[PDB]
Design a protein around this ligand. Sequence first.
Ligand SMILES: Cc1cc2nc3c(=O)[nH]c(=O)nc-3n(C[C@H](O)[C@H](O)[C@H](O)COP(=O)(O)OP(=O)(O)OC[C@H]3O[C@@H](n4cnc5c(N)ncnc54)[C@H](O)[C@@H]3O)c2cc1C
Ligand SMILES: Cc1cc2nc3c(=O)[nH]c(=O)nc-3n(C[C@H](O)[C@H](O)[C@H](O)COP(=O)(O)OP(=O)(O)OC[C@H]3O[C@@H](n4cnc5c(N)ncnc54)[C@H](O)[C@@H]3O)c2cc1C
Ligand SMILES: CN1CCC[C@@H]1c1ccc(O)nc1
Ligand SMILES: CN1CCC[C@@H]1c1ccc(O)nc1
Ligand SMILES: CN1CCC[C@H]1c1ccc(O)nc1
Ligand SMILES: CN1CCC[C@H]1c1ccc(O)nc1
Lengths: 427, 427
Amino acid sequence: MYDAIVVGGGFSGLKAARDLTNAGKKVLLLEGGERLGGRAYSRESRNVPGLRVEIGGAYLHRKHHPRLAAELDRYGIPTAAASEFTSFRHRLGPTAVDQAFPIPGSEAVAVEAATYTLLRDAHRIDLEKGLENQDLEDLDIPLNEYVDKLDLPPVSRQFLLAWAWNMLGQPADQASALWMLQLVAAHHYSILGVVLSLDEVFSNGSADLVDAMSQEIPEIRLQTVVTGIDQSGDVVNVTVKDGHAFQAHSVIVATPMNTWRRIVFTPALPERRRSVIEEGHGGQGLKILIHVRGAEAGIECVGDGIFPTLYDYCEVSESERLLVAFTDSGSFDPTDIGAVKDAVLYYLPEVEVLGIDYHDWIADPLFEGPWVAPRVGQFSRVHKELGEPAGRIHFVGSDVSLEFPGYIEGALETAECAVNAILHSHH
Amino acid sequence: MYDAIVVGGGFSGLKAARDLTNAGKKVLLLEGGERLGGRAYSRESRNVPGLRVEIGGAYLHRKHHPRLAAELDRYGIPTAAASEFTSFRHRLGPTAVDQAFPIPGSEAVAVEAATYTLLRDAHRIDLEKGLENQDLEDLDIPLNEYVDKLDLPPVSRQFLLAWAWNMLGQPADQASALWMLQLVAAHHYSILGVVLSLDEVFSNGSADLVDAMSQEIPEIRLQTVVTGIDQSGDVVNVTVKDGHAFQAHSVIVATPMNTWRRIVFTPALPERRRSVIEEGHGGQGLKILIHVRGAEAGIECVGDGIFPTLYDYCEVSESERLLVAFTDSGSFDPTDIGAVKDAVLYYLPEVEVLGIDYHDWIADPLFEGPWVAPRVGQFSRVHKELGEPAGRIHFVGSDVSLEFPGYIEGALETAECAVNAILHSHH
Ligand SMILES: Cc1cc2nc3c(=O)[nH]c(=O)nc-3n(C[C@H](O)[C@H](O)[C@H](O)COP(=O)(O)OP(=O)(O)OC[C@H]3O[C@@H](n4cnc5c(N)ncnc54)[C@H](O)[C@@H]3O)c2cc1C
Ligand SMILES: Cc1cc2nc3c(=O)[nH]c(=O)nc-3n(C[C@H](O)[C@H](O)[C@H](O)COP(=O)(O)OP(=O)(O)OC[C@H]3O[C@@H](n4cnc5c(N)ncnc54)[C@H](O)[C@@H]3O)c2cc1C
Ligand SMILES: CN1CCC[C@@H]1c1ccc(O)nc1
Ligand SMILES: CN1CCC[C@@H]1c1ccc(O)nc1
Ligand SMILES: CN1CCC[C@H]1c1ccc(O)nc1
Ligand SMILES: CN1CCC[C@H]1c1ccc(O)nc1
């Protein structure tokens, strides 16, 4: 039997397993898939042989992501500046300026005011308390409604909404304003930081870090899907799909929130958590890598398109590139290449689409979603609780971070808390 | 005898006198100088024959200055756009961008944060209550100290301080932060609005409006300096320098605050007011018109010079212009033409200074100062009170406006209040 079983080998599970191991605990890591890294997933391009791409998480900022920065330094993992944007092709209307910050002077005063309002509202959020524990309900309303209250002129309005669509992976009428503001808060109470934290990337892919961490974890089982976690007895029994059971004093659930509903917990999880876990979060983010010809280097596009954003990803040749688009899978069907062409051409009418590459995270039974974003009304009811222990079962992951949810950094942060919890546990 | 004597024929006195007259009151306006208009003073250029310039107040914005806008509409007074700025020659360091808003991206996050802080602080101010009545003392500290707390990087820091020097007519160590914030508040809680309200000018000079208003005032005495105001009796006695006395039921003091200390009030003014009135406010603003050769049209300069700002005023010929510089008379001696040349050349090394034109408001016994700005510590002690009646003597003027102090608009606003007060008076 083990001191701890860690379920899921994303960055959260990987950190927990590693750190517990180095603390002298006897750990088993169970991973359901054929690979480690989870929603961090570097692989060969489907479109361009020999070219390595990120199909999930990719971007970081040392200043905002200190835990991640520490991991990089720890293993000597090379990073690079994200591609500088030098050509701006927005669709924000005729008054927009083609720069990274496209707001014209005529809108300045409006933006000044909105900046105050947004930051004032964001400053209502204490990152330690949970979004359900702070009388924040008035903010937990559809983003479009909140933004309507800001009364923004057209450039700023559409610029805000575009990036919010990108960042939350939800259309404006499904996103929670409270959550937008959570993201602002996470970035040291900065709206600009939400986009400025797309700062650096893994020179050799996220798998570089994944592999470094896993080398420190002595016992890992791949292709092992946990189906039950039972703490009715003295020792936790973890049952597995086509497998013998495993047993441990403590269990760390480091699988995506939207998958928890597939595990049988005994006894049942605390009742306040149940409804949200059943429903899942509302995240529908969709990251599409687009192989193109005829695009100059360094393009950024933001506007009112079905792709709110479309921007440079990498040089393929002197004529070819990858761009990246963000949209959401409720709004957009990436199997419709005609739709992709239209979406691209809206911004870049000279460019030819050669192919696309993405992973349907929401259809993947090991995930059932991309990165976290709550449905309106969810997280002002229950949030901190989702990430709190139920007896000997801890719950970690980017999904449940109070501090940096939806980022690699949140994965690391949550793991830390669980590790500490366990090391300081009396049982 | 009169219903009302108005003392001073600036815009405040002019409005009060006119409006009381039209209400059927019998009014006398006493003006100490040889002209009406006060710190609004259009005249022929000392440098360029035949060219009319503003030697005091000049700039307005209809949106921020509705009373003034109403006066303009009332008399069909033509206005024009202030000269558009199209060439930026700042001295804000090597990272600055040469545009109206010179802040580089590297400073954006700093400016975001400062915007919140500034507006948060400004929003502490209720414009109706007076600066002494709101527990605002913690803000009434030297501007340099306040700004040090914002921790701004060099471009934004110096840009802020430059415009603040311009606007307050005080160096950073003499200006009150609370007052900066008052100005922000007045402009509907906008920092950007403080400079954006330099929007339009009088096509034919401020004297256009001055003359329009005065045509409606039936009795005016020029060259009549009031030396005493005595309300010990049933009827107010107003004594005059070399003149018979005049008498009225009510008296409106519409002279500059820094001159009140020269009048004998009987009985003495309420004791809380006395110290500030004796000291005067700390305003040292200095507006210099600079006749130049070799300057292209549309220049704006902001930076760390002894002229914080230097900008286009008017075309004189194809080779010649007027620029305008703002500084303060404690820091700068405009009789030192060498100093002027150095100050200009710092920004504009190619330009030749031909001559200058200004009025020494602070040396003018009818004024003893330019526009209002408090010394640190003054207005958190006493402010609203300065503008309140003492028995039958009312106190008006731009200097004492709660709503738009230091602007023509404040002159008009204060007059309104006094007029209303008098019309609704029971006595
Ligand atoms: C398209 C996309 C783009 C992103 N972009 C960025 C970005 O640029 N920067 C950034 O910081 N973050 C980004 N992220 C968010 C970030 O990648 C994720 O939040 C993060 O990697 C999650 O780590 P985790 O350890 O919480 O969960 P995951 O990485 O999801 O790990 C969960 C593990 O659980 C395994 N599992 C599931 N069910 C079972 C079961 N029953 N039994 C056993 N194992 C199971 C899964 O196979 C998986 O390996 C992105 C995410 C997506 C999807
Ligand atoms: C350099 C400068 C630039 C400015 N720029 C602008 C600007 O761009 N926009 C803007 O809105 N405002 C500006 N202003 C501020 C604005 O002009 C003044 O606040 C405003 O005109 C004051 O009007 P007032 O009626 O309060 O006082 P004033 O116009 O000062 O009128 C006071 C009157 O009292 C008379 N007087 C003094 N003592 C006596 C006495 N004992 N007896 C009889 N009469 C006496 C004086 O002669 C004078 O006519 C500027 C001011 C200056 C000095
Ligand atoms: C450098 N970051 C800051 C904001 C956006 C920018 C960026 C992001 C992604 C990318 O590929 N290139 C540049
Ligand atoms: C149009 N205003 C807005 C801010 C500064 C600008 C301005 C001010 C004075 C002037 O002469 N020309 C332009
Ligand atoms: C940085 N975030 C964390 C979750 C999604 C991701 C992201 C990455 C690039 C981009 O343009 N928008 C969002
Ligand atoms: C608009 N304000 C009212 C008082 C001084 C004046 C002003 C006018 C032009 C400028 O650049 N700075 C300040």
